Amino acid sequence: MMVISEKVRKALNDQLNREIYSSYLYLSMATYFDAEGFKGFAHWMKKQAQEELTHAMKFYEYIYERGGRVELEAIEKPPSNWAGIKDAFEAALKHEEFVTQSIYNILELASEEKDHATVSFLKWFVDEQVEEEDQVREILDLLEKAYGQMSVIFQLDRYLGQRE
């Protein structure tokens, strides 16, 4: 029997679908980088793509642990194109910043319902969102010091290309 409220379980099932769209958007950003020929920026986006699926599946399993069930919704067609590589990472950071407020809302909800289990579970994601945002800001700060200079963008592309 479901020991999570339907309201809270909807909030988790939504953020779940939100993390899948997160992976999808990133995969799409890989299509952008691959098209412009930065195979290393593309490699990074694909790796973030599958990291988001591991986020999705943490919500998947917690929902069933508390006796819920997941309904996968439709996935919106994500953007296909950005200005510079700086613009895509700005869209990345904005999306990440939107994802962390999505999670704060689920947190604040469960806090009102005194569902301490969901309140606790959700803290891994509060910490990982600090890392995910910071990952992106560091990249943007280096982009803006490349200042177009492409010997440096090569050094970035080759580098991000080495993420495991």
Place this chain on the structure above:
Amino acid sequence: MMVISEKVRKALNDQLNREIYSSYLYLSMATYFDAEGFKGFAHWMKKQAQEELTHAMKFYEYIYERGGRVELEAIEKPPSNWAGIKDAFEAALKHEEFVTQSIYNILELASEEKDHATVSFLKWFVDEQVEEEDQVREILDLLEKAYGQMSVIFQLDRYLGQRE
């Protein structure tokens, strides 16, 4: 873009400098124990002065992860002298309980601001302060039993001198 409010960024930069003073105070307690010939008690204070610096850096790294920047403030001269070994450790405990409260104030503040990243971050330090206080209470407890019997005080000195 700083994603922490300046009010909480100031509280953490304060708590950083406060962790540095802890390090400084403890090394001063080591100057005392060394002047009094207890080189193993002094080893403990030099080891714990080191621990405090790692605490300071945990705030350092966190402030920059949230778009902040650290400004180091002046460090008040700590005391040079205590009554005896019991008095010095009692000063240490009363100082760690003050640190614990000081951390509580930043958590109660971040909570009011719905800044859940900082509330989660400070979990590590509340758990850590539990052990810091207990480390010191444990030691005080065996000095009372010692009641001067420098066969026990000696063997304690010789054993707290193998802290890693």
Place this chain on the structure above:
Amino acid sequence: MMVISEKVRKALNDQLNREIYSSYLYLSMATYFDAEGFKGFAHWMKKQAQEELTHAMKFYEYIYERGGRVELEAIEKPPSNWAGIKDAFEAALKHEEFVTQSIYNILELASEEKDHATVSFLKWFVDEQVEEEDQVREILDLLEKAYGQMSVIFQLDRYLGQRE
């Protein structure tokens, strides 16, 4: 029983507090570099901050080995910002030149007191200073030849970030 003069003890104690300020100042230059996005330069300053505490602790242990004791004085608030990478290191070297002069003065003093134990002890620091200055001009030299591109000031940052 103390076998250094009180003039020489004080000079060693002042030097210990100067080495500790140095540690603080270097950590302060890391708070600059981290704010400006050069995690490698920040890594180098942080590693330099640790080194200066091992210099402080070498004046520590020597004072006690001569029957003396260490008083820890207050740490002045250090500068928190500089005009550029070059400018921060120019401040770094101007400081290092000031410590080597400071050490010189307390060498010439122990000489006059025909305290040969302390003259011999300070040889190590006369040697370490020669390196610590030269290490910093090598960096100013590669920075006067870097004159602008992030392509060199990156490969430099990245490599200075490998200081063990």
Place this chain on the structure above:
Amino acid sequence: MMVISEKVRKALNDQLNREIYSSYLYLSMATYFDAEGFKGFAHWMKKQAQEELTHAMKFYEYIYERGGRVELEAIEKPPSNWAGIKDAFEAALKHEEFVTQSIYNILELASEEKDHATVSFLKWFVDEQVEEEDQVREILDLLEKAYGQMSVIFQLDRYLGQRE
């Protein structure tokens, strides 16, 4: 052909005979401790007797490396008894302070003769003396805190008997 002065050679030769007396004196303090039943203190003095012969042999080899030769003079009968453990070590340190002054005098002499080879050679002994004195005050310090019980003066004897 001899390249030290005869004033400096004699001073080194007198010092060699003083290091040898030291070896004898320390062996004599072991004959006290062994009579009084403290085989560990006796072990420490015996190991110290060997060490002083390695100091004697360092003035030996240096004299021949400068074209000189060593005359062995007569060894004065040393004291054979003391008022207590504390008192014997107080005599030990009073002696060590006398050798470090003796060495100082022949350093200040080689300086005046601008014999820099011998000034540099004596650095090692200025360093070793700082340790040999400090090692003995550490023992007087643990003996002023031992003030009576064989329970501490045993665990001390036993451990000093582990000197390699």
